Structure 1
Amino acid sequence: VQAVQHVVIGPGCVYHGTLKIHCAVKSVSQFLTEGIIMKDFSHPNVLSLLGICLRSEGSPLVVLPYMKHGDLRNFIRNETHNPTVKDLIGFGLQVAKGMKFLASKKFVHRDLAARNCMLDEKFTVKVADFGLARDMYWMALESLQTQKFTTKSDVWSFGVLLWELMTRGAPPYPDVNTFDITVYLLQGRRLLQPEYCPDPLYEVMLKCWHPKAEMRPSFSELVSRISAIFSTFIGEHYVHVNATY
C-alpha cells in the first residue's frame, strides 16, 4: 500500500503519452506487484518501466519510455535504412546483453523476437514485450513438445532473432506452416545461412539451436562470442534485402 510509492506516478492498446518527456502509455493490488518488480528491471538493453498511473482511477496506465525508432524488425526492413554487417551484429549483441541481464534475474522471456525489441534515438536496443507491457500486438523443439519455457528456450529464440537481423527482417521458414514446424525440424532442418551472415555468426545460430537444451550457450557466452565477431568488422559491408524474402 505504501511500499509502491517509488513506482506509482499518480497526481489494451498503447498510446502516445506526454510527460517535458515523450513517453508511450499502455491502457490493483496485483498491479502494484509487477509494478515494483518490473521497476527493478533496469538495464541499458531492456525497456524500462517509467511508472504506473492509477489515478483516479486510471486504466491503469502503464507508462514506458518512447522509442524513437520503433521495433527492431520494422527498422531493419525499412528500405531507406542502410545497415552494415557491423550494425546488425551490433544489434544482436545488444539483445544478448539485455537477455543476459534478464537471465541473471532468472526471468524467462518466452517471446523473444525482433518485433519485440525496440530501438531508441541513440540506436540502443531495448528488449521489450515483458512484464505489464506484455501482449500480442521462434520456439525451441522441446517447447513445442512440452509447452514449457526456460532461458535455454529463450536462447533458441535468440538464434532465430539473429537470423532475422541478418536477413533484415525476413519471415523465418516462409514456405513452412506453423502446425508442422516440429515435424519440419525433426526431419533434420534449420534456417539457412543468410547471404550477408558471417560464417562464425551462423555457427553461433546453430549452437543456439542445439537439440539438447543444456548444450546451448548461455547468454553470457553469447555476449562474449558475439562481442568478438562484432569487433572484427569496420562497417564496410552493406547488407541488402533478399529478393526472395
Structure 2
Amino acid sequence: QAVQHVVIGPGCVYHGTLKIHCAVKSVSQFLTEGIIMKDFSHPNVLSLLGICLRSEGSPLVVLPYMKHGDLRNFIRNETHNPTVKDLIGFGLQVAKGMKFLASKKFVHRDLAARNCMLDEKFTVKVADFGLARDMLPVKWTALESLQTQKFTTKSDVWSFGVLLWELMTRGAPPYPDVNTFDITVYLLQGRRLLQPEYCPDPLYEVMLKCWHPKAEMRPSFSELVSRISAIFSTFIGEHYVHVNATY
C-alpha cells in the first residue's frame, strides 16, 4: 500500500500515452525503488510518473517524454546554434539538479551529458537514475573512485566538471587519444582536460576546481550553482559556439 500512489493503470524503452506523452521502460525492490524515485522532485531532475507491474506488467517504468532527448546529442546537432550563454545555462541547470540530489544524499555515479534530458522548454533534467538507470564510465569518474571503487557527491562533482567540458566543446569525447584502461596513469602524470576554445576562463577555473586532487577541496554543488549562475549572468547570447574539427 506504500506503492499504490506510484502505481498506475486503467531492457529498452518505447513510446506511450497517459493525454500526456511519455517514455515507458521495460519484485519487492522494484516497488521500493518506485517509492524512493517518486520522492525525488525537482525541475532539473527526471521525475517518475508511475510504474506498471499490472498484470503482469514486465514491469514498466513510466517517465515523462523529453521532447529534445539527451543533452549530448542535442549540443552535437549541427543544425543547433547554441551560444556560450545557452551552454552555461544547461550546466547551471545540471548543477541545480545535482545540488538537489546531493541534499537527498543521492550519489549519481554516472553524471554525463548523455545522461541528461531536455524537454520542450529546454529544461535540463538529470536522468539515468533509479529504475531508469542503464548502461565504464571511466572518462567521467573521479581519480580516487577509479582507484577505490568508492563514490561520493565529491566524485559526482568531478563528473560534473567533465560534463561542463562536454557542454563547452558541444559534445566532444573527453580524452579522445586516451584509452579507458590508461586514464588513471594519464591523470597521475599531472594532466586535466584542456580548456575548450569557447570556454570562458572563469568556467575553466570552475572545471579545474571540480577536478581538485583532494575530493574534500572540490566545491559543493551548492557552491557550483552560485558560481555558475554569476558567470552565466555576464553573457547576453551573442557568442556562437562552434564545433572543433579534430573531435
CA offsets 1:135-179 (integer angstroms, 9 cap, x no match): 01x000100100111000000000000000000000000000111
| Separation in 1, partners of 2:207, 2:229 | 15
Whether contact under 8 Å (1:72, 1:119) holds in the other structure is yes
| Separation in 2, partners of 1:72, 1:227 | 19
Q: Deviation of residue 120 (structure 1)?
A: 0.2
Whether contact under 8 Å (1:95, 1:125) holds in the other structure is yes
Q: Deviation of residue 31 (structure 1)?
A: 1.4
TM-score by length of 1: 0.98
The answer to whether the aligner puts 1:70 opposite 2:69 as a matched pair is yes
| Separation in 1, partners of 2:52, 2:143 | 40
| Separation in 1, partners of 2:231, 2:32 | 40
CA offsets 1:179-226 (integer angstroms, 9 cap, x no match): 110000000000000000000000000000000000000000000000
3-state SS, counterpart of residue 52 of structure 1: strand
| Separation in 2, partners of 1:30, 1:210 | 36
3-state SS, counterpart of residue 3 of structure 1: coil
Gap runs ≥5 in structure 2? none
Q: Deviation of residue 28 (structure 1)?
A: 2.3
CA offsets 1:69-115 (integer angstroms, 9 cap, x no match): 00000000000000000000000000000000000000000000000
Whether contact under 8 Å (1:11, 1:55) holds in the other structure is no
Instruction: Judge which range, 225-234 or 21-30, deviates more.
Output: 21-30
- The equivalent of 1:200 in structure 2 is 202
Q: Deviation of residue 11 (structure 1)?
A: 3.3
| Separation in 1, partners of 2:32, 2:54 | 17
3-state SS, counterpart of residue 110 of structure 2: coil
CA offsets 1:104-131 (integer angstroms, 9 cap, x no match): 0000000000000000000000000000
CA offsets 1:1-44 (integer angstroms, 9 cap, x no match): x1211111133100111111100000122111010110010100
Gap runs ≥5 in structure 1? none
The answer to whether the aligner puts 1:174 opposite 2:173 as a matched pair is no
| Separation in 2, partners of 1:52, 1:10 | 9
The percent of aligned pairs where both chains have the same amino acid is 100
| Separation in 2, partners of 1:189, 1:102 | 29
| Separation in 2, partners of 1:184, 1:156 | 16
Paired residues, what number?
Answer: 243
| Separation in 2, partners of 1:243, 1:3 | 53
- The equivalent of 2:125 in structure 1 is 126
The answer to whether the aligner puts 1:165 opposite 2:164 as a matched pair is no
- The equivalent of 1:98 in structure 2 is 97
| Separation in 2, partners of 1:114, 1:37 | 24
TM-score by length of 2: 0.98
Runs of 4+ in structure 1 over 3 Å off: none
